[PDB]
Amino acid sequence: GLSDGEWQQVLNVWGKVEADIAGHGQEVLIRLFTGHPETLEKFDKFKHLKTEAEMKASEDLKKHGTVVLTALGGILKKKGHHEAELKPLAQSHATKHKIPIKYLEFISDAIIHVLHSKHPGDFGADAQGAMTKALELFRNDIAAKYKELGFQ
Protein backbone atom coordinates (compact mmCIF):
# COMPACT_ATOMS: atom_id res chain seq x y z
CA GLY A 1 0.00 0.00 0.00
CA LEU A 2 1.46 3.28 -1.21
CA SER A 3 0.26 6.81 -0.62
CA ASP A 4 -0.42 9.21 -3.47
CA GLY A 5 2.86 11.00 -2.76
CA GLU A 6 4.73 7.70 -2.87
CA TRP A 7 3.19 6.77 -6.22
CA GLN A 8 4.15 10.23 -7.49
CA GLN A 9 7.77 9.48 -6.56
CA VAL A 10 7.63 6.07 -8.27
CA LEU A 11 6.34 7.55 -11.49
CA ASN A 12 8.89 10.36 -11.35
CA VAL A 13 11.69 7.80 -11.07
CA TRP A 14 10.12 5.81 -13.87
CA GLY A 15 10.52 8.80 -16.18
CA LYS A 16 14.27 8.27 -15.92
CA VAL A 17 13.80 4.68 -17.07
CA GLU A 18 11.52 5.60 -19.96
CA ALA A 19 14.12 7.98 -21.39
CA ASP A 20 16.34 4.96 -22.13
CA ILE A 21 14.30 1.80 -21.59
CA ALA A 22 16.68 -0.46 -23.51
CA GLY A 23 19.79 0.75 -21.69
CA HIS A 24 18.18 0.40 -18.27
CA GLY A 25 16.73 -3.00 -19.17
CA GLN A 26 20.07 -4.28 -20.43
CA GLU A 27 21.86 -3.20 -17.26
CA VAL A 28 19.20 -4.66 -14.98
CA LEU A 29 19.54 -8.05 -16.66
CA ILE A 30 23.34 -7.90 -16.63
CA ARG A 31 23.32 -7.09 -12.92
CA LEU A 32 20.98 -10.04 -12.31
CA PHE A 33 22.96 -12.52 -14.41
CA THR A 34 26.41 -11.55 -13.13
CA GLY A 35 25.36 -11.23 -9.49
CA HIS A 36 23.26 -14.41 -9.49
CA PRO A 37 24.56 -16.75 -12.21
CA GLU A 38 21.95 -19.41 -11.42
CA THR A 39 19.36 -17.02 -12.91
CA LEU A 40 21.00 -17.26 -16.34
CA GLU A 41 20.22 -21.00 -16.37
CA LYS A 42 16.50 -20.25 -16.58
CA PHE A 43 16.98 -18.61 -20.00
CA ASP A 44 17.57 -21.07 -22.81
CA LYS A 45 18.25 -18.14 -25.12
CA PHE A 46 20.90 -16.54 -22.89
CA LYS A 47 22.65 -19.53 -21.29
CA HIS A 48 25.25 -19.41 -24.09
CA LEU A 49 26.49 -16.08 -22.73
CA LYS A 50 29.66 -16.80 -20.79
CA THR A 51 31.17 -13.35 -20.28
CA GLU A 52 29.70 -9.97 -19.47
CA ALA A 53 31.21 -8.62 -22.70
CA GLU A 54 29.08 -11.12 -24.63
CA MET A 55 26.09 -10.05 -22.52
CA LYS A 56 26.79 -6.38 -23.31
CA ALA A 57 27.14 -7.12 -27.04
CA SER A 58 23.89 -9.12 -27.21
CA GLU A 59 21.14 -7.24 -28.99
CA ASP A 60 18.59 -9.90 -28.06
CA LEU A 61 19.36 -9.36 -24.36
CA LYS A 62 18.70 -5.65 -24.79
CA LYS A 63 15.49 -6.54 -26.61
CA HIS A 64 14.39 -8.73 -23.72
CA GLY A 65 15.26 -5.97 -21.26
CA THR A 66 12.83 -3.73 -23.13
CA VAL A 67 10.10 -6.39 -22.88
CA VAL A 68 10.64 -6.78 -19.12
CA LEU A 69 10.75 -3.08 -18.28
CA THR A 70 7.80 -2.28 -20.57
CA ALA A 71 5.74 -4.83 -18.65
CA LEU A 72 6.86 -3.54 -15.24
CA GLY A 73 6.14 0.06 -16.22
CA GLY A 74 2.63 -0.86 -17.29
CA ILE A 75 2.08 -2.45 -13.88
CA LEU A 76 3.55 0.51 -11.96
CA LYS A 77 1.35 2.97 -13.83
CA LYS A 78 -1.69 1.19 -12.39
CA LYS A 79 -0.71 2.41 -8.89
CA GLY A 80 -1.53 -0.92 -7.30
CA HIS A 81 -4.68 -1.69 -9.32
CA HIS A 82 -2.80 -4.26 -11.39
CA GLU A 83 -4.65 -7.57 -10.94
CA ALA A 84 -5.33 -8.03 -14.68
CA GLU A 85 -1.76 -7.12 -15.69
CA LEU A 86 -0.09 -9.13 -12.96
CA LYS A 87 -2.07 -12.40 -13.22
CA PRO A 88 -0.65 -13.61 -16.59
CA LEU A 89 2.89 -12.82 -15.49
CA ALA A 90 2.48 -14.69 -12.20
CA GLN A 91 0.99 -17.62 -14.08
CA SER A 92 3.66 -17.76 -16.79
CA HIS A 93 6.48 -17.33 -14.28
CA ALA A 94 5.20 -20.07 -11.97
CA THR A 95 4.02 -22.62 -14.55
CA LYS A 96 6.15 -22.16 -17.68
CA HIS A 97 9.38 -20.44 -16.66
CA LYS A 98 9.49 -21.85 -13.10
CA ILE A 99 10.97 -18.72 -11.53
CA PRO A 100 11.20 -18.90 -7.72
CA ILE A 101 10.08 -15.80 -5.84
CA LYS A 102 13.68 -15.39 -4.64
CA TYR A 103 14.71 -14.44 -8.18
CA LEU A 104 12.08 -11.70 -8.18
CA GLU A 105 13.69 -10.37 -5.01
CA PHE A 106 17.05 -10.48 -6.84
CA ILE A 107 15.74 -8.45 -9.80
CA SER A 108 14.03 -5.95 -7.50
CA ASP A 109 17.30 -5.21 -5.76
CA ALA A 110 19.03 -5.08 -9.16
CA ILE A 111 16.65 -2.33 -10.29
CA ILE A 112 17.60 -0.26 -7.23
CA HIS A 113 21.29 -0.88 -7.92
CA VAL A 114 21.04 0.18 -11.56
CA LEU A 115 19.12 3.35 -10.71
CA HIS A 116 21.91 4.45 -8.37
CA SER A 117 24.57 3.48 -10.90
CA LYS A 118 23.05 5.42 -13.80
CA HIS A 119 21.73 8.38 -11.78
CA PRO A 120 24.23 8.84 -8.91
CA GLY A 121 23.13 11.62 -6.61
CA ASP A 122 19.80 11.88 -8.45
CA PHE A 123 18.00 8.92 -6.82
CA GLY A 124 17.17 10.31 -3.39
CA ALA A 125 16.24 8.58 -0.19
CA ASP A 126 12.54 9.32 -0.61
CA ALA A 127 12.58 8.02 -4.19
CA GLN A 128 14.39 4.86 -3.12
CA GLY A 129 11.85 4.30 -0.36
CA ALA A 130 8.90 4.61 -2.71
CA MET A 131 10.42 2.49 -5.48
CA THR A 132 11.31 -0.23 -2.99
CA LYS A 133 7.74 -0.29 -1.64
CA ALA A 134 6.35 -0.52 -5.17
CA LEU A 135 8.58 -3.49 -6.00
CA GLU A 136 7.62 -5.12 -2.71
CA LEU A 137 3.94 -4.79 -3.56
CA PHE A 138 4.58 -6.28 -7.00
CA ARG A 139 6.51 -9.19 -5.49
CA ASN A 140 3.92 -9.71 -2.74
CA ASP A 141 1.01 -9.93 -5.15
CA ILE A 142 2.97 -12.40 -7.28
CA ALA A 143 3.71 -14.38 -4.11
CA ALA A 144 0.00 -14.68 -3.39
CA LYS A 145 -0.60 -16.22 -6.82
CA TYR A 146 2.38 -18.53 -6.38
CA LYS A 147 0.82 -19.77 -3.13
CA GLU A 148 -2.51 -20.36 -4.85
CA LEU A 149 -0.64 -22.50 -7.44
CA GLY A 150 1.46 -24.32 -4.84
CA PHE A 151 4.62 -23.18 -6.61
CA GLN A 152 7.91 -23.03 -4.77
Q: Is the dihedral of CA 89, 92, 93, 97 positive or negative?
A: negative
- Distance of alpha carbon 26 from alpha carbon 21, whole angstroms: 8
- Distance of alpha carbon 103 from alpha carbon 83, whole angstroms: 21
Q: Is 151 in the site for ligand HEM (CB under 6 A)?
A: no
Q: Is 145 in the site for ligand HEM (CB under 6 A)?
A: no
Q: Is 95 in the site for ligand HEM (CB under 6 A)?
A: no
CA 112, 118, 119, 124: dihedral to nearest 10 degrees?
10
- Among 43, 101, 133, 143, which residue interacts with ligand HEM (rule: CB under 6 A)? 43
Site for ligand HEM, residues 59 to 88, rule: CB under 6 A:
67-68, 71-72
Q: Is 134 in the site for ligand HEM (CB under 6 A)?
A: no
Q: Is 102 in the site for ligand HEM (CB under 6 A)?
A: no
